Amino acid sequence: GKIGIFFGTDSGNAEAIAEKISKAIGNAEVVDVAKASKEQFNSFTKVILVAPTAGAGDLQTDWEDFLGTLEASDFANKTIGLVGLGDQDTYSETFAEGIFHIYEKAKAGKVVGQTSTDGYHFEASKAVEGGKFVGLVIDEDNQDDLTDERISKWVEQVRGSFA
Ligand SMILES: Cc1cc2nc3c(=O)[nH]c(=O)nc-3n(C[C@H](O)[C@H](O)[C@H](O)COP(=O)(O)O)c2cc1C
Secondary structure (H helix, E strand, O other), X not given: OOEEEEEOOOOOHHHHHHHHHHHHHOOEEEEEHHHOOHHHHOOOOEEEEXXXXXXXXEEOHHHHHHHHOOOHHHHHOOEEEEEXXXXXXXXXXOOOOHHHHXXXXXXXXXXXXXXXXXXOOOOOOOOEEXXXXXXXXXXXXXXXXXXXXXXXXXXXXXXXXXX
16 A cells, blocks of 8 residues: 555544545555554655544554654655544543644645634634644544545545545
8 A cells, every 4th residue: 555544542433534544545554553663654655644632632642652753854755644533522622632743743744634624613722723624633422423524525635645
């Protein structure tokens, strides 16, 4: 696979999502960030990073350890895609933020997949940037039934960049 899709998960939401996103975009290899290295991250030019949100809008532990091993340097030569899971209902003030961290570094490459906030309902989020989401935002908790179409639509918007 040309496209690498790295995810960390605690309940398999992200993993199911990354699988789906691979089903749809195609030509991809799905990797748990928990069992990988920058060495494997840099085996790819075109990447899609799926990541759930933890305490204080932080990253799921595994994604947290992983990103720790990467620096802006590592995201420079890459086309990056951001796809953060989250709960808009139980965490108003911090919704699908985890991705904003990965974002802090990945803004050093070409990040595509910015999406609208329409139909999402939250008080705050570091994931909103320049007026819209830094990438795709999944909410399996409250909006599970919207996952497939958001994926189908996002892969559409993406196709171009990840080709
Ligand atoms: C410790 C904990 C903290 C969480 N914090 C947030 C949060 O800050 N913002 C948010 O939108 N979702 C938050 N969530 C929801 C998860 O990101 C969501 O349930 C996710 O889909 C789980 O991913 P997984 O099943 O791949 O592990 C939190 C979940 C847990 C367990």
